[PDB]
């Protein structure tokens, strides 16, 4: 509980500080990679793989809400690395709402399958 209390403040601190075709191919390659993960090591390989794919996706206010609601379902090291990934995304918001909802909805059903 205390460590969780130490992840949320750090997120809040971060938030306060902040205050074509070739891309569609990189979205599809990211899905094939997310699909190999689908049905500490067993979290660590999906969690390492999550980084090169979110970088490829999003190199190519509302997105922090969508990822924050995604994080509240994940919360409700294996949580702590998704929280550090969330903190980086509070400083670097990038993407488009419809696609970011589809990618995070595939996060919700991948988390409901690790469930």
């Amino acid at each position: 509980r205390n460590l969780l209390v130490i992840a949320l403040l750090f997120v809040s601190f971060m938030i306060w500080q902040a205050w074509g075709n070739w891309g569609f191919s990189i979205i599809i390659i990211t899905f094939i990679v997310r699909g190999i993960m689908y049905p500490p090591l067993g979290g660590c390989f999906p969690l390492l793989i999550q980084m090169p794919i979110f970088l490829a996706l999003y190199y190519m206010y509302i997105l922090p809400i969508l990822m924050g609601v995604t994080m509240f379902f994940i919360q409700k090291i294996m949580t702590f690395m998704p929280v550090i990934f969330t903190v980086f995304f509070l400083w670097f918001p990038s993407g488009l709402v419809l696609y970011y909802i589809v990618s995070n909805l595939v996060t919700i059903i991948q988390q409901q399958l690790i469930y």
Partner: peptide, 23 residues
């Protein structure tokens, strides 16, 4: 610098997690 922000960021995050988790 695109590649260095790309595979700099993730490939090290990879490196430590293989190390942490898989250790």
């Amino acid at each position: 610098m695109a590649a260095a922000v790309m595979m700099g960021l993730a490939a090290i995050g990879a490196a430590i997690g293989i190390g942490i988790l898989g250790g």
